[PDB]
Design a binder for this molecule. Structure first.
Ligand code: 31E
Ligand code: 31E
Ligand code: 31E
Lengths: 113, 114, 114
């Protein structure tokens, strides 16, 4: 999995260790080795959710497999829970877009999977 | 709908009301309540379009439904009009990628929409 | 093609000329006219790959066609090569997501490519 979070919360509100936590938690959640997990957090964004500037986030999770109805519910609980606990973003102000990528459509290490 | 715009226009050129205008216009275009609608503008970007650094935008619109050939042709007029007036970007320097998301593939409020 | 690179490499490490080089190399790779090619580089990102903050990149290539198994392998060799040479990012710390977009799902100048 690769996980990207874009948020209006300020950089100083991102706690030390957040990218490590996301790595660890995504490894546990997907069963994938941490080596392949990428995480990207983008604070201080100009965004709104429902016409309001209260803390919010727009996220994506891309994986080659491990995407589906129940799995995505579980990921959303995990990830909305982290954004709430760690970044003080209400879960009802987060969207997470999930992508099940074909291996042939993911480049890595000079080739594709 | 959620709408993201990445642009090389400077932050000071993005009007304070732009996110709210987009929110409202997208609600009217899609018939969705504005509470559901998220908007994100990312200025000051290092970008080129056609090998030029003149103002440009790379955008996305994600929706669960309300995406399709005719609807997308309409949205492009709406969105190019807003980017042209408010960000001074020529409409031929804008791409918008449209994504019709399955409900099971959109997380919100600790769960998905499925 | 439109190519976007998100990286933790700092802005000062991005060579002058990098966006032009990408535009030119993508035109050669895809056979598309440079008029339609867009490139976008985002340095200074808060990023980790494999739990490490060593240089890494998350990238995307969107095209209407010209996406497929062998083609994508070639693009990845090209693009990882450029990121290694110019940004000093190891290839094994790069992901490139490829998207073969339906022409109806790509907005441009007040209409879609359909
Ligand atoms: S393993 C976890 N993520 C690998 C990946 C990268 C792009 C799609 O899936
Ligand atoms: S309602 C408008 N947007 C909701 C949404 C978020 C992601 C895909 O669709
Ligand atoms: S031509 C190269 N890119 C055009 C494009 C933009 C979005 C999908 O394809």
């Amino acid at each position: 999995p690769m996980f990207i979070v874009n948020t209006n919360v300020p950089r100083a509100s991102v706690p030390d260790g957040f990218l490590s936590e996301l790595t660890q938690q995504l490894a546990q959640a997907t069963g994938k080795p941490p080596q392949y997990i990428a995480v990207h957090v983008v604070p201080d964004q100009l965004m709104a959710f429902g016409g309001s500037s209260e803390p919010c986030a727009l996220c994506s999770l891309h994986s080659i497999g491990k995407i589906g109805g129940a799995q995505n519910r579980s990921y959303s609980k995990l990830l909305c829970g982290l954004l709430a606990e760690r970044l003080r973003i209400s879960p009802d102000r987060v969207y997470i877009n999930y992508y099940d990528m074909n291996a042939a459509n993911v480049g890595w290490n000079n080739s594709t999977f």
